Amino acid sequence: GIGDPVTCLKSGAICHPVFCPRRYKQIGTCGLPGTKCCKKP
């Protein structure tokens, strides 16, 4: 659940590799890549 490559979008999480700026956080992905999805912490 919340915290995946797909569901990541389900939470409107942003797509950012390496890390994610801003007071945001999630620890998700984007797609097949180990992208770093960020969402409202």
Which domains does the chain possess?
Answer: 1-41 (3.10.360.10)
CA distance 21 to 7: 20
CA distance 9 to 7: 5
CA distance 16 to 28: 9
Single out the residue of 24, 23, 30, 25 nearest to residue 7, CA to CA. 30
DSSP code of residue 41:
-
| Cβ-Cβ contacts under 8 Å for 40 (sequence gap 6 or more) | 11, 24
Asked how this structure was determined, the answer is NMR
